[PDB]
Design an enzyme around this catalytic site. Structure first.
Site, short mmCIF file in Angstrom:
data_model
loop_
_atom_site.label_atom_id
_atom_site.label_comp_id
_atom_site.label_asym_id
_atom_site.label_seq_id
_atom_site.Cartn_x
_atom_site.Cartn_y
_atom_site.Cartn_z
N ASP A 110 0.52 -1.11 -0.34
CA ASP A 110 0.39 -0.22 -0.04
C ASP A 110 0.55 1.50 0.22
O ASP A 110 1.79 1.59 0.82
CB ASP A 110 -1.15 0.18 1.23
CG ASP A 110 -2.55 0.94 0.98
OD1 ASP A 110 -2.51 0.72 -0.27
OD2 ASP A 110 -2.00 1.99 2.25
N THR A 111 0.56 1.96 -0.89
CA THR A 111 1.56 3.74 -1.18
C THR A 111 0.93 4.79 -1.12
O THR A 111 -0.69 4.61 -1.17
CB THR A 111 2.08 3.60 -2.30
OG1 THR A 111 3.17 2.79 -2.59
CG2 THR A 111 2.66 4.80 -3.20
#
Ligand SMILES: [Cl-]
Ligand SMILES: [Cl-]
Ligand SMILES: [Cl-]
Ligand SMILES: [Cl-]
Ligand SMILES: [Cl-]
Lengths: 204, 204
Positions: A79-80
């Protein structure tokens, strides 16, 4: 990871490209976990990013085992997120989000966090048992001062839609990004070098 | 500059990749001025790169003019160099030379300088008249301590041969570059962000 079944729980093509270029062979199974985790419930942004990656990988790992009774050897989640001024920015819901996102990032230095979850799976007693190793990577990115004209032409470019914060560092975002400080692949979507260091520790 | 004739005075595919992706329409005319300038004649590595970028663009301008006696409106020249501990690294001459530059850059930090020359031309009084704007960009790059079998396999790739320091940024699956401090597209070969800001000071 030589003889193991690797599953990547993300439909992001830039993530697959990074891992494909590194030589990793893997299956792509997008997660059905929708990221409605309360951001205020975490002490740090990278904590929220790592836990989101964990839940996306776990949802994929359990869905696969429940489907055909085989435990995938490794499920990788990621997850960015982007943080500017303490606020958390994810991928825009439309352009009014993307524009106001880039409006906030204009002329400042912000942080990009990618949380990664490496989930080792096995099956025991008709149950999927999981060993999760979490890590994150931070990269600082500085935007130039953006007129509302170029802000808008880039909002419109279709680029910001599925990128964290509504921008990339290649292609049209190069007119926005003034400098990068840290691991640049982390900004594209995956911290490759940190991911490699985490593998050798989990095994040796 | 939206109705002018633009020429890129370089044959590097990444340089045209960066500007084409930015929306700039231009011609590619490789310069035949060779990077033979006397390094000892400059005080700084970036002065050397900028002047080298200047003469390479001026050669294309003169060549285009002497052929058609109508000037291309704008010629862009660039020269990317690498400095590690003060030593200047440019494009390698053969595989063992590129092998050498990688093993000196392995595991430590170096600097990437790209000087850019923007040459405004006019051919109104039946002569080539030029007005050139110079600038440069610096990015600090740190390499991983990668195995040797891997570096020579990157050398027999043919990839290092056309690049300053004998590396592209996608080298070795993206594992060669550990971190970046400065403009990212500068390391690929063209400071696009600085280039667009240089255009606004030339016109407005
Ligand atoms: Cl928080
Ligand atoms: Cl950092
Ligand atoms: Cl700008
Ligand atoms: Cl000088
Ligand atoms: Cl010098």
């Amino acid at each position: 990871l030589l003889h193991k079944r690797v599953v990547l729980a993300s439909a992001s093509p830039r993530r697959q490209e990074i891992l494909s270029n590194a030589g990793l062979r893997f299956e792509v199974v997008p997660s059905k976990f929708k990221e409605k985790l309360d951001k205020a419930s975490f002490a740090t942004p990278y904590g929220y990013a790592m836990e989101t990656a964990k839940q996306k990988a776990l949802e994929v790992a359990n869905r696969l085992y429940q489907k055909d009774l085989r435990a995938p050897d490794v499920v990788i989640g990621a997850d960015t997120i982007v943080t500017v001024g303490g606020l958390i920015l994810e991928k825009p819901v439309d352009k009014q989000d993307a524009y106001r996102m880039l409006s906030r990032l204009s002329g400042r230095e912000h942080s990009v966090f990618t949380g990664v979850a490496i989930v080792h799976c096995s099956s025991k007693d008709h149950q999927l048992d999981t060993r999760v190793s979490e890590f994150y990577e931070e990269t600082k990115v500085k935007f130039s001062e953006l007129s509302e004209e170029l802000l808008w032409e880039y909002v419109h470019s279709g680029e910001p839609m599925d990128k964290a914060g509504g921008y990339g560092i290649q292609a049209l975002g190069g007119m926005l990004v003034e400098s990068v400080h840290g691991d640049f692949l982390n900004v594209v979507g995956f911290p490759l070098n940190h991911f490699c260091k985490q593998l050798v520790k989990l095994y040796y």
